[PDB]
Amino acid sequence: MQIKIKYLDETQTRINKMEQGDWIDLRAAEDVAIKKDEFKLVPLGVAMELPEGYEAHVVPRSSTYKNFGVIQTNSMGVIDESYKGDNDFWFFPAYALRDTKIKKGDRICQFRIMKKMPAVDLIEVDRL
Amino acid sequence: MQIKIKYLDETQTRINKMEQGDWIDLRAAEDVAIKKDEFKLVPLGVAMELPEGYEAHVVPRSSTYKNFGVIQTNSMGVIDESYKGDNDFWFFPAYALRDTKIKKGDRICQFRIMKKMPAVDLIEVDRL
Amino acid sequence: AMQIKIKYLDETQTRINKMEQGDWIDLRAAEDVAIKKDEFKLVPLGVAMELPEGYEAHVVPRSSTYKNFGVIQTNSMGVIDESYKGDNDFWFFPAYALRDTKIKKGDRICQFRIMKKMPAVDLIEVDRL
Ligand SMILES: O=c1ccn([C@H]2C[C@H](O)[C@@H](COP(=O)(O)O)O2)c(=O)[nH]1
Ligand SMILES: O=c1ccn([C@H]2C[C@H](O)[C@@H](COP(=O)(O)O)O2)c(=O)[nH]1
Ligand SMILES: O=c1ccn([C@H]2C[C@H](O)[C@@H](COP(=O)(O)O)O2)c(=O)[nH]1
Ligand code: NA
Numbered sequence: 531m532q533i534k535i536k537y538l539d540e541t542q543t544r545i546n547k548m549e550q551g552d553w554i555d556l557r558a559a560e561d562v563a564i565k566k567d568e569f570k571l572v573p574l575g576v577a578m579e580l581p582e583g584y585e586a587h588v589v590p591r592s593s594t595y596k597n598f599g600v601i602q603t604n605s606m607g608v609i610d611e612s613y614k615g616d617n618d619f620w621f622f623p624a625y626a627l628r629d630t631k632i633k634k635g636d637r638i639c640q641f642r643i644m645k646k647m648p649a650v651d652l653i654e655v656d657r658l
Numbered sequence: 659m660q661i662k663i664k665y666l667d668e669t670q671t672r673i674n675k676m677e678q679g680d681w682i683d684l685r686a687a688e689d690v691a692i693k694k695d696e697f698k699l700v701p702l703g704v705a706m707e708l709p710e711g712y713e714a715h716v717v718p719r720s721s722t723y724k725n726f727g728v729i730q731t732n733s734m735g736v737i738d739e740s741y742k743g744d745n746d747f748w749f750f751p752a753y754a755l756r757d758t759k760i761k762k763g764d765r766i767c768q769f770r771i772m773k774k775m776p777a778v779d780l781i782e783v784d785r786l
Numbered sequence: 787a788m789q790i791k792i793k794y795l796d797e798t799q800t801r802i803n804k805m806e807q808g809d810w811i812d813l814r815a816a817e818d819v820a821i822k823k824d825e826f827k828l829v830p831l832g833v834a835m836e837l838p839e840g841y842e843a844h845v846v847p848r849s850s851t852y853k854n855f856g857v858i859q860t861n862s863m864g865v866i867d868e869s870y871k872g873d874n875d876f877w878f879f880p881a882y883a884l885r886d887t888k889i890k891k892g893d894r895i896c897q898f899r900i901m902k903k904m905p906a907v908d909l910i911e912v913d914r915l
C-alpha cells in the first residue's frame with residue numbers, strides 16, 4: 531500500500547521512506563515562537579492521501595518536551611482517510627509550558643497509520 | 659460486531675452510528691465549570707458493553723482545546739471490555755489551562771474501539 | 787503464545803504480572819521520585835524488554851495517575867520500538883507535575899500494550915491531491 535504526499539513548498543524537507551514500519555517524523559514548516567502558557571498550531575508542511583480504510587495518529591517525539599517545552603493539546607491527533615484534499619495540510623497543536631522557539635525544519639512530532647475500526651452496530655439498551 | 663449502549667437518562671443525546679469506521683464524538687452529560695489549573699471528571703452519560711476481546715480508546719477532539727481550554731490528563735483513556743456494568747459510566751478527565759465552562763450536550767472527546775493486544779508471555783531474563 | 791523478554795534493573799524491582807485477558811499492563815516506579823509543581827522528571831520504570839519482532843509498545847498514564855500523583859505524560863503516548871531491546875535500554879515515564887508530588891518506589895504509574903508495527907508503505911510525492 532502507498533501514501534501520496536504533497537508538500538507545502540519546495541523548501542520542506544522530504545520525509546523518511548516507510549519501508550520499515552517505524553513511526554515517521556514530521557517537521558515545522560516555518561519558525562514558530564510560543565510564549566509560556568500560550569498555544570500555537572505548528573504547521574507540518576505536508577498533506578497526504580492515506581490508504582483507503584486507514585487513519586494516521588500523530589504524537590510528540592520522545593525528545594520534544596525536553597528540547598522544546600511543548601505538549602500536544604489534543605494528546606494524539608487523528609487524521610482520517612477523508613483528510614486528503616489539496617489544502618488539507620497537517621499541524622501539530624502545541625502548548626508551551628515555557629517560552630520556546632521552534633525553527634523551520636525542526637522535527638516536532640511523529641506519525642503512523644492504523645486500520646480504522648471495523649463497522650460496528652450501536653444498539654441502545656435500557657440496562658447492561 | 660455490535661456495542662450495547664446505555665444512556666444515563668432520556669436527555670442524553672443519542673450518539674452517531676458506527677457504519678463508516680470514523681471515531682465517534684461523546685458529549686458532556688451535564689454542565690461542568692472548571693477553574694484555571696483545576697481538574698474535573700466530565701461525565702459523558704454513556705455506559706457500553708464493548709465486543710468481546712476489544713477495548714475503547716478516548717482522546718480529545720481536535721477543536722477541544724481551542725474551544726474549551728482543557729487537556730486530557732490521562733492522554734488517551736483506555737476502557738477495557740470488562741467495564742461493562744450497569745453503573746460503569748464513562749468520563750473525560752479534564753484539566754483546565756484557563757477558566758472554562760462546558761455545557762450539557764457539548765461534544766468534548768472522541769472514541770474508537772480496537773482489538774486488545776495478542777496473547778503474549780512475559781519471560782524474565784538476566785540479560786538482553 | 788508470543789514472548790516478551792523482560793530484564794529488571796535489580797532484584798528490588800517488583801516483577802510485573804501480565805493481565806491474562808489481554809488488558810494493558812501496569813509498570814512501576816523504580817525509585818522514590820519527588821517532583822515540584824511545574825517541573826519535569828523522567829521517572830525510571832526499572833525494566834528493559836525485547837518485544838516480539840514486528841511489534842512496538844505503547845505507554846500511557848493509568849486512569850488514576852493524575853488523581854494519585856498530579857502528573858501528566860509530556861509525550862502523550864510513549865512509543866517503544868522493537869529495536870529498543872538492548873541490555874541498557876530501560877523504560878521511563880516522562881512526568882510533568884501540575885502540583886508538588888511524590889511518587890513512591892513500586893507505585894503503578896503507567897500502563898503499556900504491544901501493537902503490530904504499521905506495514906511497509908510506499909511514500910509517493912505528488913504535486914496535487
Ligand atoms: O493533531 C491534529 C489533529 C487533526 N489534524 C487535521 C485532521 C482533521 O481532519 C483536521 C481537523 O478537522 P476536525 O477533526 O476538527 O473536523 O485537522 C491535524 O492536522 N493535526
Ligand atoms: O479516560 C477514561 C479512562 C477510564 N474510564 C473508565 C474505566 C475505568 O475503570 C473507570 C474508573 O477509573 P479509575 O477510578 O480506576 O481511575 O473509568 C473512563 O471513563 N475514562
Ligand atoms: O515514554 C517513553 C518514550 C520512549 N521511551 C524509550 C524508547 C525510545 O527508543 C527511547 C528514546 O529514543 P528516541 O525516541 O528519542 O529516539 O526512550 C521510553 O522509555 N518512554
Ligand atoms: Na521523517
Ligand code: NA
Nearest residue numbers: 671763764765
Ligand atoms: Na451535535
Ligand code: NA
Nearest residue numbers: 799800891892
Ligand atoms: Na517495589
